[PDB]
Design a protein around this nucleic acid. Structure first.
Ligand SMILES: [Zn+2]
Ligand SMILES: [Zn+2]
Lengths: 95, 79, 101, 120, 64, 54
RNA sequence: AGGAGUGGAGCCUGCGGCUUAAUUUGACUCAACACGGGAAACCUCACCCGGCCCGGACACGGACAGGAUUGACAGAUUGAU
RNA sequence: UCAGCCACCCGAGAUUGAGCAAUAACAGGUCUGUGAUGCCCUUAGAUGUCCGGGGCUGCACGCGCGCUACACUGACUGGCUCAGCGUGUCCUACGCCGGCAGGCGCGGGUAACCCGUUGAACCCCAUUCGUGAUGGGGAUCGGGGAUUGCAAUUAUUCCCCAUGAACGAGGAAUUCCCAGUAAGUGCGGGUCAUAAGCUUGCGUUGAUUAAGUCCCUGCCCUUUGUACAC
């Protein structure tokens, strides 16, 4: 894989924290990460590599993969995206 | 144009079947009982039944927040 | 103003007729000239499946159904009051559709 | 040899649209819906076997993978191996097989020679 | 009969821009091989002049 | 490689259609837009809304 | 008590059996044999003949920025650009 | 003189047809429907997977579902006249070019609004053919023509010309059925790019005989007796 495909995957794992898929290998475009031309294979196998680290939660359904944040995934992302902890994601917006 | 009422009323079924299947598979530990999908063109709310409902929410409403974004980005309808 | 028509479709009959009765009573409350609930020919979707998963036994079949009752009430009233009446009796299991002018 | 009332030599310079009308409707439909890169490459290698062979030697067996290919008048005379699924076979393109596929001379099954029956 | 397994491995010279870039004592930069006229490999990425052609690394163009 | 991988066209036929819940290809209910297997429809038919009246 | 038959002919389909490179396989009284939603030109597809790809996560040690990997035009071989 | 059975009156109706279905069991079938699954095998000349080509259909012979029939209560050709359950973004209205399958453009329909008045077939009313291997019956084959597809040769189908097979009501045996029921007849759905002789539904025409028994097939209960208790 190239490195620029992976870097837009962690950004929607911080503010919301979840990432779904399709389990379609030959699917040429992942439709949620449009305008980047990343295949479904290159987000699905990347999250398979991330599940052996222990940073995404595995839950399957009829067809779609599902991947949640881990509680240790916030600290691993806040340095990899080089973010300050002063900004708050959707965890503590309401009430 | 939209879809026919025959194909509309069945497509409301495969929504609630996949939702209930995914909800059983995820929430099979906190005593998941069933959904109730109240449809509305403004907000299609999904009422989760559970045994220990305070433990479903997470830390002051944290765990179900993940499931909101899951069902948002899954079934195509916007947030 | 002409052709103000409300589409009421449901999967069961009891809640659909209750919603029809509440809408007709509310249109009686507004004192409009009201074509009542007409009754479209109900559709019944047939699916006939072999009952076995493999294909061994005595060729028994299943017979599933979905009966979609469809009603239509009609009004002759301006557009500002037809939105007030449909927003009250929100109820699950039914589906509302309106058309105007 | 004459095909549909015209001899072989006028078929070699016969252009495509006038070559069309002497066929059946299946061959005309194949020539109307088009020939793709997998067949034009075979025309390229077949004309290559025309120019790289000495003229008194009928050229080397251009083994082929297009059973669906109609025997055009341009490909007459070349030695061709047609894959049946297991092996190849060199078949000679005689002039009298213009309205036929390539994949019909390679019999993809051994003809059944029966014996005594088993349990019955 | 016999399993014929083969893969063309790559063999790189010690920073093979020295095969491309030549600078003499006066300091002018002389590139021996061909620069590709295509824009995606323009002015920095060079072709390799072969015995009968040149060959680009990106758009794989040939010459005579 | 990258061009010969999924090159055979997966339009029409049962190679193109597969089960919505289990990705199988044998006994597919297409009517009313389901694309479920026959074995898998019977699991979910009560939650779709298909009941047995006779 | 009867009625329509089937078993007889041709054809179509499903099983045995003979072959086949392969003719994928389950199922053999009622309770197998137009059953496997099984009417398969490719896919389906299991079977046979070849040919690519890793889609071997992760951990360890080596190679390691004098490179491991990839596309490779043209010619040769191939069924193929 | 009890539960109830039989006949009649009044009545639309004096049995409508299905769905669902116990305990206890099969060493019943199904890892080939499942990201239901245990072990075992296999994992980079891969039993993973894609690509391409064959095969699944091959054919001296047996066995099962069916379809067409063997004619006159019929066939050929005109004319007339009637449905219901259903599907539809791919269903189709209308004008033109063609023997026809088909080409063209125009619209409608996400549907009691359009196809659609769903102008179905047996049946009916006339013409011709008259008991013969006939024009019955169409198999088998040669040629074209047109569609769907990346591709039709191992005919995918469909149309038009030809060729004309057995077949003269079918032994031993055996299946299903008691009323809008057999049976005849078409239409729709599933499969479906192309597709029904299959199956699942629907309407149309519409009867013979029975309203009884344990003789056969098989199941159950009570009195026998056991050397039985797999
Ligand atoms: Zn370049
Ligand atoms: Zn399924």
């Amino acid at each position: 894989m190239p490195k620029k495909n992976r870097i837009a995957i962690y950004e929607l794992l911080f503010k919301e924290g979840v990432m779904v898929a399709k389990k379609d290998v030959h699917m040429p475009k992942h439709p949620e990460l449009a305008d980047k031309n990343v295949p479904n294979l290159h987000v699905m196998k990347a999250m398979q590599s991330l599940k052996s680290r222990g940073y995404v939660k595995e839950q399957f359904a009829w067809r779609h993969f599902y991947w949640y944040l881990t509680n240790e995934g916030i600290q691993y992302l806040r340095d990899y995206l080089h973010l300050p902890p002063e900004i708050v994601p959707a965890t503590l917006r309401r009430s | 144009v939209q879809i026919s009422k025959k194909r509309k009323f069945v497509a409301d079924g495969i929504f609630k079947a996949e939702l209930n299947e995914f909800l059983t598979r995820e929430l099979a530990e906190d005593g998941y009982s069933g959904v109730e999908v109240r449809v509305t063109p403004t907000r299609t709310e999904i009422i989760i039944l559970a045994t220990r409902t305070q433990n479903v929410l997470g830390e002051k409403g944290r765990r179900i927040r993940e499931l909101t974004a899951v069902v948002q980005k899954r079934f195509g309808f916007p947030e | 103003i002409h052709r103000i028509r409300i589409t009421l479709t449901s999967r069961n009959v009891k809640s659909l007729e209750k919603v029809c009765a509440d809408l007709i009573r509310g249109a009686k409350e507004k004192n409009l000239k009201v074509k009542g609930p007409v009754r479209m020919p109900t559709k019944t979707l047939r699916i006939t499946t072999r009952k076995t998963p493999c294909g061994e036994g005595s060729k028994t079949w299943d017979r599933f159904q979905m009966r979609i009752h469809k009603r239509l009430i009609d009004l002759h009233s301006p557009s500002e009051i037809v939105k007030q009446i449909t927003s009250i009796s929100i109820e699950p299991g039914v589906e509302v559709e309106v058309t105007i002018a | 040899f004459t095909y549909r009332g015209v001899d072989l030599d006028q078929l070699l310079d016969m252009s495509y649209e006038q070559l069309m009308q002497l066929y059946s409707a299946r061959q005309r439909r194949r020539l109307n819906r088009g020939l793709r890169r997998k067949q034009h490459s075979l025309l390229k290698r077949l004309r290559k076997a025309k120019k790289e062979a000495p003229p008194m030697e009928k050229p080397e067996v251009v083994k082929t993978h297009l059973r669906d290919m109609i025997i055009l008048p341009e490909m007459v005379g070349s030695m061709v191996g047609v894959y049946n699924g297991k092996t190849f076979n060199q078949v000679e393109i005689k002039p009298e097989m213009i309205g036929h596929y390539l994949g019909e001379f390679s019999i993809t099954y051994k003809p059944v020679k029966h014996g005594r029956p088993g349990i019955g | 009969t016999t399993p014929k397994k083969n893969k063309h491995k790559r063999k790189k010279v010690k920073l093979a821009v020295l095969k491309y870039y030549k600078v003499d004592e006066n300091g002018k930069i002389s590139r021996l091989r061909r620069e590709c006229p295509s824009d995606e490999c323009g002015a920095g990425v060079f072709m390799a002049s072969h015995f009968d052609r040149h060959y680009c690394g990106k758009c794989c163009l040939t010459y005579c | 490689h990258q061009q010969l991988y999924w090159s055979h066209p997966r339009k029409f036929g049962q190679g193109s259609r597969s089960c919505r819940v289990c990705s199988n290809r044998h006994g597919l209910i297409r009517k009313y837009g389901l694309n479920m297997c026959r074995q898998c429809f019977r699991q979910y038919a009560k939650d779709i809304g298909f009941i047995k009246l006779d």
